[PDB]
Design a protein around this ligand. Structure first.
Ligand code: ZN
Ligand code: ZN
Lengths: 107, 50
């Protein structure tokens, strides 16, 4: 990330001193000792998942005493939760039911 | 062997079918517009939502 000198407002560079790494200006004496953990997370865009789970994938989210799907009222359906974008998104829930003479897709 | 404006005029058998077919197509297109703008559209494979 860009960080700028409070004095002259040029761009700081990271360098190493005798006790710490420092943010340092190239044009004025100002330095800032990195005393503690500092971070910057990008969170880039992940792949699409729409055509990846279709067609009898290796799902696993099913559990004992799981709810039946609302239309058929049978537990013959899978359900999953995934991030669709990066993991700062709150996970969305989706489910699909597959029964005899019955095909549907629901949210 | 001649042509005329009575050779391209629509009779009564067409001006009732055209109205119903236009209404069916317009209502299905309005339903797909409403299903794209405000929620779930069952996306065809290999394309975006629009
Ligand atoms: Zn400076
Ligand atoms: Zn089903």
């Amino acid at each position: 990330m860009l960080l700028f000198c409070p004095g002259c407002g040029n761009g700081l560079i990271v360098e190493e001193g005798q006790r710490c790494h420092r943010f340092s200006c190239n044009t004025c004496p100002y330095v800032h000792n990195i005393t503690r953990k500092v971070t910057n997370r990008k969170y880039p865009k992940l792949k699409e998942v729409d055509d990846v789970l279709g067609g009898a994938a290796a799902w696993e989210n099913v559990d004992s005493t799981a709810e039946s799907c609302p239309k058929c009222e049978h537990p013959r359906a899978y359900f999953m939760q995934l991030q669709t974008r990066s993991a700062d998104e709150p996970m969305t829930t989706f489910y699909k039911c597959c029964n005899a003479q019955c095909g549907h897709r629901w949210r | 062997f001649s042509i005329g404006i009575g050779d391209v005029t629509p009779g009564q058998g067409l001006l009732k079918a055209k109205y119903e077919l236009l209404n069916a197509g317009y209502k299905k297109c309005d339903e797909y517009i409403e299903a794209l703008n405000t929620g779930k559209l069952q996306q065809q494979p290999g394309c975006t939502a629009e």
